[PDB]
């Protein structure tokens, strides 16, 4: 039975090598060969197959994803960390590598120093979901001054009215009312000061109505004097209250 299994493995490897040699650029043959080598419990053989496939074409996302998933499905954690470090240093613009690296080093790794590794992604100015996930990760690690610096760099790097509203809500939920008032004042001074966005003023009026109704009425009057229908609705709400 061992000789028959060896002949079957030799025939399967010969057909896989012939399919590789017939069409080199077809990566599905590489993926099927690597998964068949991993299914027969040959980790270093599948690692050599994946390294050959990455030498053939390193720009494919799925080769890195499958080779890192094969490293993570076994106990080779440091091999997976090396694979993710190479995938980050070659292809920084693929956010899926960053997301799966952070889920590997946060759930399975459980290392806070990976957040410093995450700061490498903060060199690259990613999309806003990275900033939101880092805000929620710093909240899950119970840090609020670090998250204040994160949201300040988010406002400086990606300035938006929704971003300033999220900064105001995060400063209100972290029990820093003076910092929330200073952030609302800076957003009124900078974000849409002459553009007349009429949405950060509504959030400042809501924060003032949470704080003091006279300042909320003054903010509603200033928003009505600077200006739409939402400003008139906020002025009617301030006059009714």
Partner RNA sequence: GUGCUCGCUUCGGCAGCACAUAUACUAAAAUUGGAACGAUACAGAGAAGAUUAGCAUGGCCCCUGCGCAAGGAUGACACGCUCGUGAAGCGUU
Which residues of this chain interact with RNA, rule CB under 7 A? 17, 21-22, 24, 28, 99, 103, 129, 132-133, 135-137, 166, 169
Min separation Cβ 17 and RNA, Å: 4
**Helix 27-39 to helix 43-56 angle, to the nearest 10 degrees?**
170
Q: Which is nearer to RNA, 10 or 196 (CB)?
A: 10
Q: Which is nearer to RNA, 98 or 201 (CB)?
A: 98
**DSSP characters over 19-77:** HHHH-SS-HHHHHHHHHHHHHTT-HHHHHHHHHHHHHH-TT-HHHHHHHHHHHHHSS-H
Min separation Cβ 150 and RNA, Å: 11
* Cβ-Cβ contacts under 8 Å for 52 (sequence gap 6 or more): 30
**Helix 128-140 to helix 114-122 angle, to the nearest 10 degrees?**
160
Min separation Cβ 97 and RNA, Å: 13
Q: Which is nearer to RNA, 22 or 142 (CB)?
A: 22
Min separation Cβ 107 and RNA, Å: 7
**Distance (Å) of CA 206 to CA 36, 168, 180, 188, 228:** 60, 11, 12, 14, 17
Q: Which is nearer to RNA, 24 or 182 (CB)?
A: 24
Min separation Cβ 166 and RNA, Å: 7
**Distance (Å) of CA 234 to CA 2, 87, 176:** 81, 50, 25
Q: Which is nearer to RNA, 41 or 174 (CB)?
A: 174
């Amino acid at each position: 039975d061992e000789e028959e299994l060896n002949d079957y493995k030799l025939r399967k490897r010969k057909t896989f090598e012939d399919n590789i040699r017939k069409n080199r650029t077809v990566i599905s043959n590489w993926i099927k060969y690597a998964q068949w080598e991993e299914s027969l419990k040959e980790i270093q053989r599948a690692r050599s197959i994946y390294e050959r496939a990455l030498d053939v074409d390193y720009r494919n996302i799925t080769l890195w994803l499958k080779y890192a998933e094969m490293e993570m499905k076994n106990r080779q954690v440091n091999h997976a960390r090396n694979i993710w470090d190479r995938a980050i240093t070659t292809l920084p613009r693929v956010n899926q590598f960053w997301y799966k690296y952070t889920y590997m080093e946060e759930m399975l790794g459980n290392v806070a120093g990976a957040r410093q590794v995450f700061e490498r992604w903060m060199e690259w100015q990613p999309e806003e979901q990275a900033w939101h996930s880092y805000i929620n990760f710093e909240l899950r690690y119970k840090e609020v001054d670090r998250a204040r610096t994160i949201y300040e760099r988010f406002v400086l790097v990606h300035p938006d009215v929704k971003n300033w509203i999220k900064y105001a809500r995060f400063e209100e939920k972290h029990a820093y009312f003076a910092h929330a008032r200073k952030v609302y004042e800076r957003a009124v001074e900078f974000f849409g000061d002459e553009h007349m966005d009429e949405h950060l003023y509504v959030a400042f009026a809501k924060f003032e109505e949470n704080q003091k109704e006279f300042e909320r009425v003054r903010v509603i009057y200033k928003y009505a004097l600077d200006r739409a229908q939402e400003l008139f609705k906020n002025y009617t709400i301030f006059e009714k209250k």
